[PDB]
RNA sequence: AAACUUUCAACAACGGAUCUCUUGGUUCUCGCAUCGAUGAAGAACGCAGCGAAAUGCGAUACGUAAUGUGAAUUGCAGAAUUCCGUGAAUCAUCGAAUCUUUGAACGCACAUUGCGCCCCUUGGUAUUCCAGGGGGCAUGCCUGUUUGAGCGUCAUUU
RNA sequence: CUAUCUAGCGAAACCACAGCCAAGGGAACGGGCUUGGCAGAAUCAGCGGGGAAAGAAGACCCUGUUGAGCUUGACUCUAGU
RNA sequence: CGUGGAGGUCAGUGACGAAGCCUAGACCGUAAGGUCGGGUCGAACGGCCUCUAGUGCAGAUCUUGGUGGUAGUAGCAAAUAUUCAAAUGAGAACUUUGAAGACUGAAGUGGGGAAAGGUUCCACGUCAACAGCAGUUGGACGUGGGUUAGUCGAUCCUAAGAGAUGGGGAAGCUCCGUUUCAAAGGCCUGAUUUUAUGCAGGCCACCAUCGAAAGGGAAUCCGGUUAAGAUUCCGGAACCUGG
RNA sequence: GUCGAAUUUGGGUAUAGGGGCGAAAGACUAAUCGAACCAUCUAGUAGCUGGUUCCUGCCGAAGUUUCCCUCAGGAUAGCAG
RNA sequence: UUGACCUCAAAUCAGGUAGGAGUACCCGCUGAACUUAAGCAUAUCAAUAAGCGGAGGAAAAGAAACCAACCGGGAUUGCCUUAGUAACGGCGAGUGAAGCGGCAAAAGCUCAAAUUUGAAAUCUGGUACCUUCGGUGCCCGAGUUGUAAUUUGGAGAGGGCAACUUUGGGGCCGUUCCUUGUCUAUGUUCCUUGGAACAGGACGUCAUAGAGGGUGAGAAUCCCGUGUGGCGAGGAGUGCGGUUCUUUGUAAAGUGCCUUCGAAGAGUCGAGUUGUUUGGGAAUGCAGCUCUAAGUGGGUGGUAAAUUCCAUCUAAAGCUAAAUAUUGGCGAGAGACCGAUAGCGAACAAGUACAGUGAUGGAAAGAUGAAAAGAACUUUGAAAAGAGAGUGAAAAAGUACGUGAAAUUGUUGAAAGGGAAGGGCAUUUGAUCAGA
């Protein structure tokens, strides 16, 4: 079956593909459902922005090492030098990561300042006071966003 | 124009829920409106009909044609009035059926639960 | 066979309960798409295969 | 159903008995015994490429070229031969566009909705339905498309403050956000000349 | 009209036994009548209150047993609770909540904090 | 010239196309997580005033109890119309029960409605025979109890 | 005893359309075509010349990069030993 | 050009009759087709601009269904054979009764049974279908009635064999094996009778179960009785087993 | 043909599909046998046979070249739109 | 002789548990061939179908013996990519991942190896009582061949000094969620047609309701509903918001510095070979057999090996929600889908009737009418039925029922006809008909 002067091509169709063919058609209500569930997720959770604040971190492998990103979670010397324990910053919204170390000076100064203005922008409601309902906000990367150096 | 994602709008569902309706819900289907006194008398739009409510045909060939309802039956979907009938070519007569939607309640059978009926629905006076 | 097992005897009967044309008040009832007896039996037509 | 047609185990008779070779359901004493099966031919049998989920439903329009069909879909709503030509009933109406105050915004009664476009002069483009309702012909009216009719104004706006309730009972009539504008609601079946009424806000809004 | 059963539960259970015999005797009496007189309706009365009488017969000995097994572990296995077998075979909420001591002391010293974003 | 054959039309047949219907299917999406030794799914046989089925049910048998509604059911018959009521209904709901013989199926069997054993009780003088009623007797495994076995083995008497 | 005729009952095979020939030419053996011979309703019993009659997508032969049964130091393996 | 469905429009057509169908009636188009009249009919449907496809049939020994010619044709001719009268009935070659003539000729066309069938048995009513003619008759149709056991069978035994357990194999469904490499036992009783049991005297174990309506096997006969049951019911007369 | 023993036969029982069973015919194994039946893989593949559904308008062929486990097929060039 | 211990038994011992079903999705095992390669064996189909074992509402995976080689990322899963690429392959046909990057969702952890040794501090069961998903007392037992507390590599532990900070559960009502009940607008005004008005016309009303359905024809306004709100009922649960008794506790946890330490899993890793498998190529995983480690060790770093470094993790033990799947179950909403030869095989007493020994195979079959008003009565006939009468809007709707095509058929009418018929051009004749 080779006809004419056309590329040849490497279609994968000789096992029973269709019996695995996965229409998306619930894309619009799958985001519908996210939705749903980030709503009821945020009304659930105390005022609380939804998710945890990120450390900035720079992507490996030099196709991405010159650009800055949101990692998994600071690491122990992060939080150590901007004034908390580990189980302390996970109880008030911070992602650790005992994984990640820190080899850069500049990495690990942005990511104590950023744990610094997240404690300095964030209010802990007293497990036995009153803290008057305080306007959650969703978004903790929003607030906190991620600069390119 | 309707809102709710559990009320359907498909036709199909629609005539099965109505065709398979139990004999409560039918009860609630075979509504009848009340006649101008009676709205007036009472405050309210329609109700149930029941066996022995009094009624005046105001549509179909028995326009006009009154009595006091014989049976609701509510398995055909209709209601029979006394004296509302087809006399048959072998002399016997046979109730008519006809729909409660058109006809018009002129008095109400009452005791305890109609009376209830009428001032949960918002009735003035029973 | 004339010396049968009870379970072949009960089936028996279940089918001479059941071998009957049906009732005519029903064709009177209300809606009553029912006109015959479908299921029918004879002994020269079909066998009950026990 | 991927399986229909296809629950039987027929199989062909072979050459040699004077009939067809297409499968035929075996064994007997039924009637479909010895039929015909899994043909696109045959009674009972499978359609001829069944009809698949994974057919392309949605289509993919470049988003500029989007954009030009909805500036040209308002721009054409500005055409009063458009208009016109578009069903629409705008003849005694003042200039097209047709721009009205802010105060329709907060309307919120179907009863002086009506009455603000009346006065504003949609009143034959209302009336255009309520008597071009007609049944579907054909079997989409068992389909929950029982009904048809025409298109009446869409009324555009810049901030929903009662309007949309107030006009989402009058038949034909369509309320859209300025910020949003649908080209399915512009160019009714391609076809270019929707009649629109702007309020104030959403004719500033359109810059 | 048949018997009632919240007329029966006022009574004890000799004189619902004998309220029993006595439907019984009746029904057969009537069964008997059934075989000269066509469609005689007035047996299914006497079937529902002989079901009537022998539902609160039941009611009332199981009640007595229940009150006897009150309080103890161990109940028969039908006054149990019919959930799901798999219900029944679930840890109880005693179970499921247990913790270590390490656990419980490490969840009380850091619990999930209250807290909001305000800028 | 009839008869006959053929063609067409009208009316009548045969047949069930077409059209219009649609409590059905099909596909998509959304939500939820709940079978069974407390005997499941499935099966057999029965149950109604008059039913063969479908459906429902189990000798309490188209059902009992409970709750709600508030006057039916309906093919006939019958009942009832107190029905201003703890109350009609082939109603809805359903938390209490019943649930034949089975079935993983559990005393042993089962091409048998075959054959045991134990306990309580009743009758026939009746612990022993016969019968009736009620309640039980499977296997593997776990924790525990009790009774044991082995010069496997410790100590004491010896 | 059929066949035959009658009363009753009542199929099937097969059927492009059909059915008189001779020669011609033609896919080289026509019911149709050409040229002639001719040609008169509706039919019954027989008959086996013809319908290259029916029955079956030739079983022989060939082709297929289609098999299968069987055999052998064909190729490649394998249970067992 | 035409078809099913979709967006728009003609505020299109329509119970004063939509669609469909019939119509050697009319008109338009080269044509695919379109339009009109008449009849029938009864609830929807169309023109135009676009969208979409399960979109157009003469064939496929095509599929399903229906229908022909063949054709009132082939045929309904094995098993010796029927006939007369009456009755019944609307109707009799076929039903019933009587008369006659025949046959099976006891290795039966007789009387019973096993397998199988399952109510076909019997009565009453009864002929639309079925009984390849007929039918008043029937193994049909409709409604009912009917099968009575200590002694006849099953039930029990083992046969060829089947097959749990103990064990072993197998990823496993399961397989092997049937007394095997198993701690596989109840039935007896001195005493105990704090209770005829436990301790506690003593006697016997190479082993589930299934497998025969013809093998083996406890014991019943005669007479009468029904529309239809009989070694079963009734009468009489026996017998066996357990106690 | 044979008809008193390598006899005939009932019931029970065992042997199951590359398996059984065969006083041997490739016989028989439920009208199925040189590999049963049932369902699924499976709408198996087919260079081979058959069919392939509206109108009109315009243009309009090839059976030749080379290569192929190729010779009833394809690629290629040519002819055509 | 007595009393243990260990091991092994028995009991219809006390209390439990497993089996089977479903099986769409999920975790494994086992495992083809048709097919493609234009033959065919490796290959492909396919790590698929069939077979077997085992779960849940999801499962599995999962907090690195990871990826990388960077200025390093940081559990797992899924999507868009990477990419029809690296690679595999009679290097033929074919096959074919992964890292990075963007995003969805996010969540972290716990055992073993430690002397509590100034106190087995631990736990099942029985029993009595209670406020009963449990608690307390008592008593047996389990357990030192190790049950608690303490630690899990990110650490952490034992000692010394310094202080600071923080805290537990049940009540009542809300709230969240689930299952439910009920109430909540406006014409049956007039005219015409019609059997029926729900049609057409006129005049109105409500519209946060003109979705949908019913009712004798196209009904917002006749009925149910729809829209918008109100008022209840019964639960699940502490997710969280308040009120109040409690007051936990000189118990528990965190934090700095100094010092000594720092246990970290074996027939396992790894190696050879065999088979399978993978894109994994001197061998990707898996498994069998043989060999069989170490502790500044070990694994990996995608070309075998020796040597020297480096980088990165920490196996041979374990738990974990979401994002992800879902031709099954339950409950919902929909469609440019099909409209009774279609659509599931089944719109209907369909997995039914029926066939087969059996495994299995498996149909056909919807529509009177608004309402039975289902044809009283007369007459002919043995009867079936006919003719009338009648009901009905219609019997050109009579249950052999909406419409009612064609094939085929009867009757009537017309016409033609010597071994076919049918057709084309043209005209005669007859019949019929439009146009001005
Ligand atoms: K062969
Ligand atoms: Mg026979
Ligand atoms: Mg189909
Ligand atoms: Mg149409
Ligand atoms: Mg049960
Ligand atoms: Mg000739
Ligand atoms: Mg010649
Ligand atoms: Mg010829
Ligand atoms: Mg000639
Ligand atoms: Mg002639
Ligand atoms: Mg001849
Ligand atoms: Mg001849
Ligand atoms: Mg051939
Ligand atoms: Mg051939
Ligand atoms: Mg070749
Ligand atoms: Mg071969
Ligand atoms: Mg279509
Ligand atoms: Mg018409
Ligand atoms: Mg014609
Ligand atoms: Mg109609
Ligand atoms: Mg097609
Ligand atoms: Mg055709
Ligand atoms: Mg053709
Ligand atoms: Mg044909
Ligand atoms: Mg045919
Ligand atoms: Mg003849
Ligand atoms: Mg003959
Ligand atoms: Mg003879
Ligand atoms: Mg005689
Ligand atoms: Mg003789
Ligand atoms: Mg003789
Ligand atoms: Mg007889
Ligand atoms: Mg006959
Ligand atoms: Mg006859
Ligand atoms: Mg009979
Ligand atoms: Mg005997
Ligand atoms: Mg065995
Ligand atoms: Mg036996
Ligand atoms: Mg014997
Ligand atoms: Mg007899
Ligand atoms: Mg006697
Ligand atoms: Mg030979
Ligand atoms: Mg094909
Ligand atoms: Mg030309
Ligand atoms: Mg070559
Ligand atoms: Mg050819
Ligand atoms: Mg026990
Ligand atoms: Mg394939
Ligand atoms: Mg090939
Ligand atoms: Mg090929
Ligand atoms: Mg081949
Ligand atoms: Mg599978
Ligand atoms: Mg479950
Ligand atoms: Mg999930
Ligand atoms: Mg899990
Ligand atoms: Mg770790
Ligand atoms: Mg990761
Ligand atoms: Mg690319
Ligand atoms: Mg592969
Ligand atoms: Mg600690
Ligand atoms: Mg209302
Ligand atoms: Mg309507
Ligand atoms: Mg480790
Ligand atoms: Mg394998
Ligand atoms: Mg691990
Ligand atoms: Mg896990
Ligand atoms: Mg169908
Ligand atoms: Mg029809
Ligand atoms: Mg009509
Ligand atoms: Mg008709
Ligand atoms: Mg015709």
Aim: charged share 30%.
């Amino acid at each position: 079956a080779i006809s004419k002067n056309l590329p040849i091509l490497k279609n994968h169709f000789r096992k029973h593909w269709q019996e695995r063919v996965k229409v998306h058609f619930d894309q619009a209500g799958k985001k519908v459902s996210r939705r749903n569930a980030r709503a009821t997720r945020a009304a659930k959770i105390a005022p609380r922005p939804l998710d945890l604040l990120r450390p900035v971190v720079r992507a490996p492998t030099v196709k991405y090492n010159r650009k800055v990103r949101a990692g998994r979670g600071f690491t122990l010397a992060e939080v150590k030098a901007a004034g908390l324990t580990a189980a302390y910053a996970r109880t008030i919204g911070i992602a650790v990561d005992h994984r990640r170390q820190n080899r850069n000076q500049e990495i690990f100064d942005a990511n104590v300042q950023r744990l610094k203005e997240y404690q300095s922008k964030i209010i802990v409601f007293p497990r036995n006071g009153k803290a008057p309902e305080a306007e959650q906000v969703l978004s903790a990367a929003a607030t906190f966003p991620i600069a390119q150096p | 124009a309707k809102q709710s994602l559990d009320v359907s709008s498909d036709r199909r569902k629609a005539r099965k829920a109505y065709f398979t309706a139990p004999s409560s819900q039918r009860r609630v289907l075979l509504s009848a409106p009340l006649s101008k006194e009676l709205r007036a008398q009472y405050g309210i739009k329609a109700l149930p009909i029941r066996r022995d409510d009094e009624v005046l045909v105001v549509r179909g060939s028995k326009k006009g044609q009154e009595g006091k309802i014989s049976s609701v039956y509510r398995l055909k979907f209709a209601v029979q009035v006394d004296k509302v009938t087809k006399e048959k070519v072998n002399g016997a007569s046979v109730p008519i059926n006809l729909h409660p939607s058109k006809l018009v309640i002129t008095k109400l059978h009452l005791d305890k639960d109609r009376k209830a009926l009428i001032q949960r629905k918002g009735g003035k006076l029973e | 066979a004339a010396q049968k097992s009870f379970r072949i005897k009960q089936k028996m009967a279940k089918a001479k309960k059941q071998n009957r044309p049906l009732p005519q008040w029903i064709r009177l009832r209300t809606n009553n798409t029912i006109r015959y007896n479908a299921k029918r039996r004879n002994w020269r037509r079909t066998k009950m295969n026990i | 159903s991927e399986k229909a047609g296809h629950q039987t185990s027929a199989e062909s008779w072979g050459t040699g008995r004077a009939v067809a070779r297409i499968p035929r359901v075996g064994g007997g004493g039924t009637g479909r015994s010895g039929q015909g099966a899994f043909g696109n031919m045959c009674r009972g049998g499978r359609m001829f490429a069944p009809t698949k989920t994974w057919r392309k439903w949605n289509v993919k329009v470049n988003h500029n070229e989007k954009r030009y069909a909805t500036a040209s879909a308002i721009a054409a709503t500005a055409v009063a031969s458009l208009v016109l030509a578009r069903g629409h009933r705008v003849e005694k109406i003042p200039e097209i566009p047709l721009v009205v105050s802010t105060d329709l915004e907060s309307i919120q009664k179907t009863k002086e909705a009506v009455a603000a476009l009346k006065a504003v002069g949609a009143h034959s483009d209302l009336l255009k339905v309520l008597k071009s309702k007609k049944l579907r012909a054909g079997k989409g009216k068992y389909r929950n498309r029982r009904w048809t009719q025409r298109r009446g104004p869409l009324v555009v706006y810049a901030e929903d403050n009662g309007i949309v309730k107030a006009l989402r009972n009058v038949p034909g009539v369509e309320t859209a956000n300025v910020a949003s504008l649908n080209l399915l609601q512009l160019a009714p079946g391609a076809h270019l000349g929707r009649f629109v009424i702007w309020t104030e806000a959403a004719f500033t809004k359109l810059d | 009209a048949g018997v009632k059963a919240y007329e029966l539960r006022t009574k004890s259970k000799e004189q619902l036994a004998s309220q029993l015999v006595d439907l019984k005797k009746e029904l057969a009496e009537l069964k008997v009548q059934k075989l000269s007189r066509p469609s005689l309706p007035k047996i299914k009365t006497v079937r529902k209150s002989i079901a009537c009488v022998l539902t609160v017969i039941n009611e009332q000995q199981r009640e007595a047993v229940r009150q006897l097994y009150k309080g103890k572990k161990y109940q028969p296995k039908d006054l149990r609770a019919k959930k799901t077998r798999a219900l029944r075979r679930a840890l109880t909420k005693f179970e499921a909540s247990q913790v270590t001591e390490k656990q419980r002391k490490k969840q009380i010293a850091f619990p999930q904090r209250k807290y909001a974003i305000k800028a």
